Design a binder for this molecule. Sequence first.
Ligand code: NA
Ligand code: NA
Length: 91
Amino acid sequence: MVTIDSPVAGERFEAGKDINISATVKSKTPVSKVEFYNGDTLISSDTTAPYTAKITGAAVGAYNLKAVAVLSDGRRIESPVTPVLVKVIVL
Ligand code: NA
Ligand code: NA
């Protein structure tokens, strides 16, 4: 399986802060890279566990975070989507 461990679904953040994203991959097949998305846009990828990306200086809005493990055989494994919201100020 592939899981986003941070942030958690529904978390709120403040504008201009980095959103640090962490993902865990459990597989028998070697992982070539974990690709990190916001909606359909590729943020970055990581070839080395623990797998992470960051949205640096996050602008305001709704972000739908997903991780996709690409195994060495080509097979893609999706995480569920982790939606977060970035606001001007979080009370
Ligand atoms: Na890493
Ligand atoms: Na397979």
